[PDB]
Amino acid sequence: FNMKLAINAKTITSGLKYALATGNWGEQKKAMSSRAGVSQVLNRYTYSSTLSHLRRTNTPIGRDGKLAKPRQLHNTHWGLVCPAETPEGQACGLVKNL
Amino acid sequence: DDEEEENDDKILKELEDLRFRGQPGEAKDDGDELYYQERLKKWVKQRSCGSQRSSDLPEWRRPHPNIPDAKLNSQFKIPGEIYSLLFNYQKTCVQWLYELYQQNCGGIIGDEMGLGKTIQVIAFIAALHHSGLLTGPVLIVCPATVMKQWCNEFQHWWPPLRTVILHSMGSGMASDHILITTYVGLRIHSDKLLKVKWQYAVLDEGHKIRNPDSEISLTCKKLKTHNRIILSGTPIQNNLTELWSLFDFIFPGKLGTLPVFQQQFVIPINIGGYANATNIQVQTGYKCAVALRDLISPYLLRRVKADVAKDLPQKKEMVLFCKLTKYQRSKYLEFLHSSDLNQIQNGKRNVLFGIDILRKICNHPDLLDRDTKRHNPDYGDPKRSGKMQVVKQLLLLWHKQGYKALLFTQSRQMLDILEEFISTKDPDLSHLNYLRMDGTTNIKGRQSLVDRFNNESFDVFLLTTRVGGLGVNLTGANRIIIFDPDWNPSTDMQARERAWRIGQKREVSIYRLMVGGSIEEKIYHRQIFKQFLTNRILTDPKQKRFFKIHELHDLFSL
Amino acid sequence: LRMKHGTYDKLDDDGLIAPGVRVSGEDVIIGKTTPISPDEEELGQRTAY
Amino acid sequence: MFFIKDLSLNITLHPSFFGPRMKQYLKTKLLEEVEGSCTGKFGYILCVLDYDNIDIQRGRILPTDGSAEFNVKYRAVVFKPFKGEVVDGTVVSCSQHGFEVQVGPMKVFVTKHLMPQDLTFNAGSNPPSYQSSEDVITIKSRIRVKIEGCISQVSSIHAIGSIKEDYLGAI
Amino acid sequence: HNGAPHHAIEEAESLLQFHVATYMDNDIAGQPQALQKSGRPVKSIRARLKGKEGRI
RNA sequence: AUCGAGAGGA
DNA sequence: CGCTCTGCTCCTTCTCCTTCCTCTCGATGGCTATGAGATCAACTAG
DNA sequence: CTAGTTGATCTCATATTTCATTCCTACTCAGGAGAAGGAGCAGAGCG
């Protein structure tokens, strides 16, 4: 066992490295249960971009692309997420900043 | 016989066209086919019409006008003169061939090399032709170098027999009895030839049809005749499926199909290697495989050389051992650590052929690359391989002792590296005169080199295991070294038997270089287990010695 | 083989450009080669490497 | 067999060649490209008729190219053979390898098996001739040929023949 | 060729049919999404010739 | 090079 | 008036479906493979 | 024209009988609209 476990220590190491490097939060098998985009390259265009990236969120629900009441500025968001900082395009209202 | 339509010829004279210069080639091919069918221009020399087949027959009629000893002198159901000429176990062999002929199913015969596999069957064929009044046809298959032999014995003992060579012959089926061909020739002639239904079909190199899936074995199988026989040079060497294929060719209906055999007729746990309900190890697998061996014994013959050839000086199983150098050990560990990409990558230079990388590290770490020319000026370097040092020591000892040494090597790259080493790298070995051989050597040159070795003034004869069959006679050898595990045990037997032909009065010491703790020892263990399986299926001893395959199979990978 | 159309005259013996050199266009900044096949002695008869 | 058939060939014409002399150039180009041509559809193009009265319609400019493509209509004389058909050809040569005859633009061919069984080759005759049977066939004589096959080459059309029967003898 | 049992021949026929079908169209509204060794669905000819960026 | 993913822009 | 038939209605399955441009990061690694032996062709010379 | 020699290519090949196993692990995260196909039913004509 002393070395049989060490054979699969690469399992832990490479699994964590894959999950964080690629963003596919699964086991790296077939994008199974993948949440591609969980981990992103830290933006460093300027200081404000870095700070905003480090304080960002994401709603997987809207990835389906549905057009309905969600991805709107609910008023329970008062004082918890920025009412103005939200991207354009598909992610408007699904990406929110604390 | 040029039957080409003259219409196209006079059209060509009307307007010649050089673009159809391949049409002459097609016509040559068609003429060759028509030769093999019913014609021949200059191929009478290949034991065909114009030879003893239909021309020199009178040379034998005066001594016996179509009435040989099988008919005139001591006439019986069998010949009388040949039997007197025949030796012990040969008359019995022909008698059992006669029994099998009455059985009208087939058979398989073979004795230890040098005991006359080629003989004892020509006599039986002649007996059937004359005493048995067998009109034929009779078929033989073997390599051309052995086809010339078969023809020589045929024309020597039994001139009246009509035998011919299916290499570059003609007429054949167009004329009347016996036909000899090559296995590759058999593949080429997938035409009606397979439908001839050769009454007496006999295959010489049964070892060449061991694999059921091999094209040679299946091609022979399609040619079904009431009496099909195999003269395998050696019995089972790799798997019992080989014996299944042989028996199916000779005795299809007397044994089960491939499944029945593999799931049941398999000495390993398949048949109950622990038939006594003992450890899953294959140590008590008897009364089931032994039953199959006893069932097949009424269909196989075997004479041990010791039976009549007791004049065989001592053999030596001296397994040398080597030490892996620090450079070699470092590269070995590096590969082992980096080998696991898919952990087998379907082999492909990791396990199945990563064994090749390990072997290259063991033997020629200095020139471990396809682009050896970049390192050739400074390499090989024996300092990186202690096996080379051991070889140098043994060769120098045998040179000072004046022993003709045989060296058996792996793929020709290692051969050339060793040649360069001995010739230039070490002046000590340069003083020794040496000889060379490879698979690319010409047949005439191969025979010349063999003759030189048998009476050589040289010291070292570097040889490759695979080249040449059992016919290569190297009785002049006085010492033997095996450079690495030569895979199939049959190859090892052939290599150690290069010196051991009929003769070889001077004792020969056989050595096998080995690296302690390396995968080579594991390969040797696998070969030992293969030999144990061969012994079990051949003699059925109560051998409890059994390497623990249940874990050693995976251990042997690396 | 197929050595790029840019300028190699700006590289050093290390296969790198010394800092302070003015590089423009498709000039080569890192010089790296693959001593790989074809492993043919015919090529040795031709250009050695 | 000789017969007259209609023809319709498409001619492209480079714009630089457009001009008052266009019709003459069209006629020249077609007559040089067609007269004596070999075709498997129509054998040999022997003669183009009504050279004065030629209906060229008149053609169209290619979409992305200024060149003009013309479909010129014709009545033309052509010759083709038929299997089973008898031709009164003129001999050209004789040989033990076979016998061949000329028919206008085509050369008929006769096989060893298509001469009379009694008509063997006499190489000793000068010129070589089929003197075996009562009907002597010489190289410069004339003979009827019984066609049993058409041989097609891109550069020429050929055919086979037979002289077995009496009515197929020398003329 | 070797006179294999009925069920083995049936299985081989089904496997060949499945591979051919996936080759022409690797989306059959069924469970067996044929996929490559690397873990990516095979790009059938239908997939190449279908949809935006789809050869038409 | 390929494919996949993410970021953003009109 | 019971039988049968049939179209008519309704209710589940059962698929199949959304301009253009530019960056960067990374994960694929390649799905066949012994050399020998034997045959064929290609070069060569009389 | 052709027989000889030699380079070149084609097929050979088979595994060796085998450990051995877990099992298969599930959250996030579609649904929307339309065709299709069956299933039931009720009445109308029959016997």
Side-chain angles (χ1 to χ4, degrees), chain B residues 540-551:
Chain B
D540 284 307
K542 308 293 98 170
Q543 180 175 50
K544 302 293 180 286
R545 182 72 180 89
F546 171 83
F547 290 88
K548 187 176 186 184
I549 295 171
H550 315 296
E551 301 174 6

mmCIF file with all atom_site columns, all heavy atoms in Angstrom, chain B residues 540-551:
data_model
loop_
_atom_site.group_PDB
_atom_site.id
_atom_site.type_symbol
_atom_site.label_atom_id
_atom_site.label_alt_id
_atom_site.label_comp_id
_atom_site.label_asym_id
_atom_site.label_entity_id
_atom_site.label_seq_id
_atom_site.pdbx_PDB_ins_code
_atom_site.Cartn_x
_atom_site.Cartn_y
_atom_site.Cartn_z
_atom_site.occupancy
_atom_site.B_iso_or_equiv
_atom_site.pdbx_formal_charge
_atom_site.auth_seq_id
_atom_site.auth_comp_id
_atom_site.auth_asym_id
_atom_site.auth_atom_id
_atom_site.pdbx_PDB_model_num
ATOM 1   N N   . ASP B 1 540 ? 3.310  -35.310 -19.869 1.00 0.00 ? 540 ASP B N   1
ATOM 2   C CA  . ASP B 1 540 ? 2.403  -35.310 -18.728 1.00 0.00 ? 540 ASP B CA  1
ATOM 3   C C   . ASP B 1 540 ? 3.108  -35.737 -17.444 1.00 0.00 ? 540 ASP B C   1
ATOM 4   O O   . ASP B 1 540 ? 2.654  -36.674 -16.774 1.00 0.00 ? 540 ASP B O   1
ATOM 5   C CB  . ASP B 1 540 ? 1.216  -36.239 -18.991 1.00 0.00 ? 540 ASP B CB  1
ATOM 6   C CG  . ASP B 1 540 ? 0.201  -35.635 -19.936 1.00 0.00 ? 540 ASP B CG  1
ATOM 7   O OD1 . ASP B 1 540 ? -0.254 -34.501 -19.681 1.00 0.00 ? 540 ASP B OD1 1
ATOM 8   O OD2 . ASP B 1 540 ? -0.143 -36.299 -20.933 1.00 0.00 ? 540 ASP B OD2 1
ATOM 9   N N   . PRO B 1 541 ? 4.206  -35.093 -17.062 1.00 0.00 ? 541 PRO B N   1
ATOM 10  C CA  . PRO B 1 541 ? 4.804  -35.372 -15.755 1.00 0.00 ? 541 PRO B CA  1
ATOM 11  C C   . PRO B 1 541 ? 4.026  -34.693 -14.639 1.00 0.00 ? 541 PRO B C   1
ATOM 12  O O   . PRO B 1 541 ? 3.281  -33.735 -14.851 1.00 0.00 ? 541 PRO B O   1
ATOM 13  C CB  . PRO B 1 541 ? 6.216  -34.794 -15.880 1.00 0.00 ? 541 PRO B CB  1
ATOM 14  C CG  . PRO B 1 541 ? 6.069  -33.679 -16.847 1.00 0.00 ? 541 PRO B CG  1
ATOM 15  C CD  . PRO B 1 541 ? 4.963  -34.065 -17.798 1.00 0.00 ? 541 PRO B CD  1
ATOM 16  N N   . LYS B 1 542 ? 4.213  -35.212 -13.431 1.00 0.00 ? 542 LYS B N   1
ATOM 17  C CA  . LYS B 1 542 ? 3.564  -34.654 -12.246 1.00 0.00 ? 542 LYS B CA  1
ATOM 18  C C   . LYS B 1 542 ? 4.368  -33.484 -11.686 1.00 0.00 ? 542 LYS B C   1
ATOM 19  O O   . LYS B 1 542 ? 4.742  -33.456 -10.514 1.00 0.00 ? 542 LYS B O   1
ATOM 20  C CB  . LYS B 1 542 ? 3.374  -35.742 -11.196 1.00 0.00 ? 542 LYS B CB  1
ATOM 21  C CG  . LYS B 1 542 ? 2.674  -36.992 -11.712 1.00 0.00 ? 542 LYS B CG  1
ATOM 22  C CD  . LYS B 1 542 ? 1.221  -36.724 -12.082 1.00 0.00 ? 542 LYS B CD  1
ATOM 23  C CE  . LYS B 1 542 ? 1.056  -36.500 -13.579 1.00 0.00 ? 542 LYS B CE  1
ATOM 24  N NZ  . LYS B 1 542 ? -0.376 -36.469 -13.983 1.00 0.00 ? 542 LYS B NZ  1
ATOM 25  N N   . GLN B 1 543 ? 4.637  -32.499 -12.540 1.00 0.00 ? 543 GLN B N   1
ATOM 26  C CA  . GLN B 1 543 ? 5.455  -31.354 -12.161 1.00 0.00 ? 543 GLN B CA  1
ATOM 27  C C   . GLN B 1 543 ? 4.608  -30.345 -11.398 1.00 0.00 ? 543 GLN B C   1
ATOM 28  O O   . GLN B 1 543 ? 3.655  -29.781 -11.949 1.00 0.00 ? 543 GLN B O   1
ATOM 29  C CB  . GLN B 1 543 ? 6.070  -30.708 -13.400 1.00 0.00 ? 543 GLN B CB  1
ATOM 30  C CG  . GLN B 1 543 ? 6.939  -29.495 -13.100 1.00 0.00 ? 543 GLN B CG  1
ATOM 31  C CD  . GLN B 1 543 ? 7.622  -28.947 -14.335 1.00 0.00 ? 543 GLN B CD  1
ATOM 32  O OE1 . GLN B 1 543 ? 6.983  -28.713 -15.361 1.00 0.00 ? 543 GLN B OE1 1
ATOM 33  N NE2 . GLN B 1 543 ? 8.931  -28.738 -14.245 1.00 0.00 ? 543 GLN B NE2 1
ATOM 34  N N   . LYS B 1 544 ? 4.954  -30.116 -10.134 1.00 0.00 ? 544 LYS B N   1
ATOM 35  C CA  . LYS B 1 544 ? 4.291  -29.104 -9.324  1.00 0.00 ? 544 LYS B CA  1
ATOM 36  C C   . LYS B 1 544 ? 4.964  -27.742 -9.415  1.00 0.00 ? 544 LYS B C   1
ATOM 37  O O   . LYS B 1 544 ? 4.424  -26.765 -8.885  1.00 0.00 ? 544 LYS B O   1
ATOM 38  C CB  . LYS B 1 544 ? 4.241  -29.551 -7.859  1.00 0.00 ? 544 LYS B CB  1
ATOM 39  C CG  . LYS B 1 544 ? 3.533  -30.880 -7.642  1.00 0.00 ? 544 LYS B CG  1
ATOM 40  C CD  . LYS B 1 544 ? 2.047  -30.780 -7.949  1.00 0.00 ? 544 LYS B CD  1
ATOM 41  C CE  . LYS B 1 544 ? 1.345  -32.109 -7.726  1.00 0.00 ? 544 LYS B CE  1
ATOM 42  N NZ  . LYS B 1 544 ? 1.660  -33.090 -8.800  1.00 0.00 ? 544 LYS B NZ  1
ATOM 43  N N   . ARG B 1 545 ? 6.120  -27.652 -10.068 1.00 0.00 ? 545 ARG B N   1
ATOM 44  C CA  . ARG B 1 545 ? 6.777  -26.368 -10.263 1.00 0.00 ? 545 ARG B CA  1
ATOM 45  C C   . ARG B 1 545 ? 5.913  -25.493 -11.161 1.00 0.00 ? 545 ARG B C   1
ATOM 46  O O   . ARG B 1 545 ? 5.548  -25.898 -12.269 1.00 0.00 ? 545 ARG B O   1
ATOM 47  C CB  . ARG B 1 545 ? 8.162  -26.570 -10.874 1.00 0.00 ? 545 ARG B CB  1
ATOM 48  C CG  . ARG B 1 545 ? 8.962  -25.288 -11.067 1.00 0.00 ? 545 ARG B CG  1
ATOM 49  C CD  . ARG B 1 545 ? 9.440  -24.722 -9.741  1.00 0.00 ? 545 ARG B CD  1
ATOM 50  N NE  . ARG B 1 545 ? 10.207 -23.494 -9.916  1.00 0.00 ? 545 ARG B NE  1
ATOM 51  C CZ  . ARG B 1 545 ? 9.684  -22.275 -9.949  1.00 0.00 ? 545 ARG B CZ  1
ATOM 52  N NH1 . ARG B 1 545 ? 8.381  -22.076 -9.836  1.00 0.00 ? 545 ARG B NH1 1
ATOM 53  N NH2 . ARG B 1 545 ? 10.490 -21.228 -10.102 1.00 0.00 ? 545 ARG B NH2 1
ATOM 54  N N   . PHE B 1 546 ? 5.583  -24.295 -10.684 1.00 0.00 ? 546 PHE B N   1
ATOM 55  C CA  . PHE B 1 546 ? 4.711  -23.399 -11.438 1.00 0.00 ? 546 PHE B CA  1
ATOM 56  C C   . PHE B 1 546 ? 4.962  -21.974 -10.965 1.00 0.00 ? 546 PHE B C   1
ATOM 57  O O   . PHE B 1 546 ? 4.648  -21.640 -9.819  1.00 0.00 ? 546 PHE B O   1
ATOM 58  C CB  . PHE B 1 546 ? 3.249  -23.787 -11.256 1.00 0.00 ? 546 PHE B CB  1
ATOM 59  C CG  . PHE B 1 546 ? 2.282  -22.786 -11.823 1.00 0.00 ? 546 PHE B CG  1
ATOM 60  C CD1 . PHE B 1 546 ? 1.966  -22.795 -13.170 1.00 0.00 ? 546 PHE B CD1 1
ATOM 61  C CD2 . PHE B 1 546 ? 1.695  -21.833 -11.008 1.00 0.00 ? 546 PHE B CD2 1
ATOM 62  C CE1 . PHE B 1 546 ? 1.077  -21.873 -13.694 1.00 0.00 ? 546 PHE B CE1 1
ATOM 63  C CE2 . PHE B 1 546 ? 0.804  -20.912 -11.525 1.00 0.00 ? 546 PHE B CE2 1
ATOM 64  C CZ  . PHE B 1 546 ? 0.497  -20.930 -12.869 1.00 0.00 ? 546 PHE B CZ  1
ATOM 65  N N   . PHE B 1 547 ? 5.523  -21.149 -11.842 1.00 0.00 ? 547 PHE B N   1
ATOM 66  C CA  . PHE B 1 547 ? 5.631  -19.727 -11.554 1.00 0.00 ? 547 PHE B CA  1
ATOM 67  C C   . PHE B 1 547 ? 4.243  -19.142 -11.329 1.00 0.00 ? 547 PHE B C   1
ATOM 68  O O   . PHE B 1 547 ? 3.293  -19.465 -12.048 1.00 0.00 ? 547 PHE B O   1
ATOM 69  C CB  . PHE B 1 547 ? 6.335  -19.008 -12.706 1.00 0.00 ? 547 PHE B CB  1
ATOM 70  C CG  . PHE B 1 547 ? 7.795  -19.333 -12.821 1.00 0.00 ? 547 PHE B CG  1
ATOM 71  C CD1 . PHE B 1 547 ? 8.221  -20.415 -13.574 1.00 0.00 ? 547 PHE B CD1 1
ATOM 72  C CD2 . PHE B 1 547 ? 8.744  -18.558 -12.176 1.00 0.00 ? 547 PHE B CD2 1
ATOM 73  C CE1 . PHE B 1 547 ? 9.565  -20.716 -13.682 1.00 0.00 ? 547 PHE B CE1 1
ATOM 74  C CE2 . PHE B 1 547 ? 10.090 -18.854 -12.281 1.00 0.00 ? 547 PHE B CE2 1
ATOM 75  C CZ  . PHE B 1 547 ? 10.500 -19.934 -13.035 1.00 0.00 ? 547 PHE B CZ  1
ATOM 76  N N   . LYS B 1 548 ? 4.125  -18.274 -10.326 1.00 0.00 ? 548 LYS B N   1
ATOM 77  C CA  . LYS B 1 548 ? 2.823  -17.730 -9.961  1.00 0.00 ? 548 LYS B CA  1
ATOM 78  C C   . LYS B 1 548 ? 2.349  -16.740 -11.016 1.00 0.00 ? 548 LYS B C   1
ATOM 79  O O   . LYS B 1 548 ? 2.524  -15.527 -10.867 1.00 0.00 ? 548 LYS B O   1
ATOM 80  C CB  . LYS B 1 548 ? 2.883  -17.057 -8.589  1.00 0.00 ? 548 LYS B CB  1
ATOM 81  C CG  . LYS B 1 548 ? 1.526  -16.618 -8.065  1.00 0.00 ? 548 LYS B CG  1
ATOM 82  C CD  . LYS B 1 548 ? 1.625  -16.042 -6.663  1.00 0.00 ? 548 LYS B CD  1
ATOM 83  C CE  . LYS B 1 548 ? 0.248  -15.735 -6.096  1.00 0.00 ? 548 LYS B CE  1
ATOM 84  N NZ  . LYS B 1 548 ? 0.325  -15.070 -4.766  1.00 0.00 ? 548 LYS B NZ  1
ATOM 85  N N   . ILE B 1 549 ? 1.735  -17.257 -12.081 1.00 0.00 ? 549 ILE B N   1
ATOM 86  C CA  . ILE B 1 549 ? 1.314  -16.409 -13.191 1.00 0.00 ? 549 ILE B CA  1
ATOM 87  C C   . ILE B 1 549 ? 0.265  -15.403 -12.742 1.00 0.00 ? 549 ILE B C   1
ATOM 88  O O   . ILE B 1 549 ? 0.171  -14.305 -13.301 1.00 0.00 ? 549 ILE B O   1
ATOM 89  C CB  . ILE B 1 549 ? 0.801  -17.282 -14.351 1.00 0.00 ? 549 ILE B CB  1
ATOM 90  C CG1 . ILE B 1 549 ? 1.950  -18.119 -14.913 1.00 0.00 ? 549 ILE B CG1 1
ATOM 91  C CG2 . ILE B 1 549 ? 0.190  -16.422 -15.452 1.00 0.00 ? 549 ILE B CG2 1
ATOM 92  C CD1 . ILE B 1 549 ? 1.520  -19.165 -15.901 1.00 0.00 ? 549 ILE B CD1 1
ATOM 93  N N   . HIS B 1 550 ? -0.515 -15.740 -11.714 1.00 0.00 ? 550 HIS B N   1
ATOM 94  C CA  . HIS B 1 550 ? -1.623 -14.883 -11.306 1.00 0.00 ? 550 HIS B CA  1
ATOM 95  C C   . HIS B 1 550 ? -1.161 -13.476 -10.954 1.00 0.00 ? 550 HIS B C   1
ATOM 96  O O   . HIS B 1 550 ? -1.955 -12.533 -11.041 1.00 0.00 ? 550 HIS B O   1
ATOM 97  C CB  . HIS B 1 550 ? -2.354 -15.516 -10.122 1.00 0.00 ? 550 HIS B CB  1
ATOM 98  C CG  . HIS B 1 550 ? -2.617 -16.980 -10.295 1.00 0.00 ? 550 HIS B CG  1
ATOM 99  N ND1 . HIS B 1 550 ? -3.442 -17.475 -11.281 1.00 0.00 ? 550 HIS B ND1 1
ATOM 100 C CD2 . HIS B 1 550 ? -2.149 -18.056 -9.620  1.00 0.00 ? 550 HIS B CD2 1
ATOM 101 C CE1 . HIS B 1 550 ? -3.477 -18.794 -11.201 1.00 0.00 ? 550 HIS B CE1 1
ATOM 102 N NE2 . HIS B 1 550 ? -2.701 -19.171 -10.202 1.00 0.00 ? 550 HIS B NE2 1
ATOM 103 N N   . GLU B 1 551 ? 0.094  -13.314 -10.565 1.00 0.00 ? 551 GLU B N   1
ATOM 104 C CA  . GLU B 1 551 ? 0.709  -12.008 -10.350 1.00 0.00 ? 551 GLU B CA  1
ATOM 105 C C   . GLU B 1 551 ? 1.936  -11.808 -11.225 1.00 0.00 ? 551 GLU B C   1
ATOM 106 O O   . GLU B 1 551 ? 2.227  -10.675 -11.631 1.00 0.00 ? 551 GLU B O   1
ATOM 107 C CB  . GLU B 1 551 ? 1.089  -11.850 -8.866  1.00 0.00 ? 551 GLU B CB  1
ATOM 108 C CG  . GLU B 1 551 ? -0.092 -11.966 -7.907  1.00 0.00 ? 551 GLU B CG  1
ATOM 109 C CD  . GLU B 1 551 ? 0.331  -11.943 -6.450  1.00 0.00 ? 551 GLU B CD  1
ATOM 110 O OE1 . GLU B 1 551 ? 1.532  -11.730 -6.179  1.00 0.00 ? 551 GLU B OE1 1
ATOM 111 O OE2 . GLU B 1 551 ? -0.538 -12.139 -5.574  1.00 0.00 ? 551 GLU B OE2 1
#
